[PDB]
Amino acid sequence: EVETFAFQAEIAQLMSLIINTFYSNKEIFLRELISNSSDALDKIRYESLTDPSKLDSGKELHINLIPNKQDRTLTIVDTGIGMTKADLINNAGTIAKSGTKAFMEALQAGADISMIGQFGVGFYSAYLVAEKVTVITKHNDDEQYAWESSAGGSFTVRTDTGEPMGRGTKVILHLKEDQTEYLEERRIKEIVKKHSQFIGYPITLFVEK
Amino acid sequence: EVETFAFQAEIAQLMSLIINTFYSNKEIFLRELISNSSDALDKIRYESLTDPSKLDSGKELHINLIPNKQDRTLTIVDTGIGMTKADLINNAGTIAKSGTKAFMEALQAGADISMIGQFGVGFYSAYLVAEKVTVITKHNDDEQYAWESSAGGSFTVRTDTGEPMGRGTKVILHLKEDQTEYLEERRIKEIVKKHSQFIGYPITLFVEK
Ligand SMILES: CCCN(C)S(=O)(=O)c1cc(-c2n[nH]c(=O)n2-c2ccccc2F)c(O)cc1O
Ligand SMILES: CCCN(C)S(=O)(=O)c1cc(-c2n[nH]c(=O)n2-c2ccccc2F)c(O)cc1O
Incomplete structure (x- = not known):
């Protein structure tokens, strides 16, 4: 059962601006998603202080970056x-x-x-x-x-009918045709080193087979 | 009844570094406290979405800056x-x-x-x-x-035995003798304009009588 929702006009307007504006510094999307992952990790870690059973769904607190050149996807877990x-x-x-x-x-x-x-x-x-x-x-x-x-x-x-994830969030970025640089190891490493060097959780960049 | 707690060593070490290091860009403390106030305001605003009774303790979502030259205090409410x-x-x-x-x-x-x-x-x-x-x-x-x-x-x-505040946090900064510039209206305005210009809540700087 799939439910469809309308974005409120201001958000729909923001999304169209982000898609259609000429802006070359696109790499900033990675910092934003990693920052949000780190905020979600802080929240579970803080809740786990007064209630340790909050970590029964997983004790590991991390961020994984998984590029997939075949699917043209960058997944942030x-x-x-x-x-x-x-x-x-x-x-x-x-x-x-x-x-x-x-x-x-x-x-x-x-x-x-x-x-x-x-x-x-x-x-x-x-x-x-x-x-x-x-x-x-x-x-x-x-x-x-x-x-x-x-x-x-x-x-x-x-x-979701897919494989259980225990707890957390998985962001699958279905990349635009001209944005495949964000699937390259050296490019991802460069962006992480520049914008997310002080994140308090291990960021693992997965290598492809 | 007053309870006394020890800071853990690393925090006590951090606090002594902040107090004793020569660092002229001291104005950054204001941005940090305003940022924390804004984060606390986001939290109540978000909780109030699914539960509107969360705002029975106060619907107003704001930040007040109250300098007091007589007490040598800067209060962030x-x-x-x-x-x-x-x-x-x-x-x-x-x-x-x-x-x-x-x-x-x-x-x-x-x-x-x-x-x-x-x-x-x-x-x-x-x-x-x-x-x-x-x-x-x-x-x-x-x-x-x-x-x-x-x-x-x-x-x-x-x-606290003082006047009730409804809900929120009041930070009373008992300023060091050589740090009274942070009680001046033009100085506070300058710092707020430079570091906290995009905070999503009204910041009111109170004038003294
Ligand atoms: C529909 C879009 C959801 N996103 C992909 S997201 O917001 O960027 C995003 C959200 C979370 C998230 N999980 N739990 C939680 O509280 N957050 C959260 C953190 C910060 C801010 C708003 C938030 F909800 C995350 O771990 C990663 C994300 O990339
Ligand atoms: C013992 C020192 C407390 N402070 C003065 S503080 O942490 O700077 C500070 C804390 C809050 C606060 N209220 N509720 C809440 O969740 N927070 C919070 C926000 C951000 C980060 C950690 C936090 F707890 C605030 O509104 C203002 C502050 O200046």
């Missing part, structure tokens, strides 16, 4: 707190609305796209490099869900 | 989620430990003190300008508490 079904829908809600409006106002006032994270809408920078984003997530208090959007004003949410 | 007694004690816990160690390692490797926030220990930059920090906080699920530390390896936690 984390074992953070994950997202509930309500969380997925709310990522296109009120906080995202005020943040989107403030960011687009800042862009009009001369700010640049790399400042997206300061408005809490950093996720949408995935659309600088991806024609489609698939998010697989599992929170301790809910089932495993698959969120997906190719922009165009909508996203879908379905219960 | 927010109506964020606030902190429980467990939260106050855990601010000197495991997450703070790994973050402190990583930050001090980065400093050895040539990083500078302004990067403190990337390690989640941004609060401790208050000790660049304050000889003592008093924190008054109220979370919906707990009583009102007063946290206090003049560094020296310890902090205290007591139930």
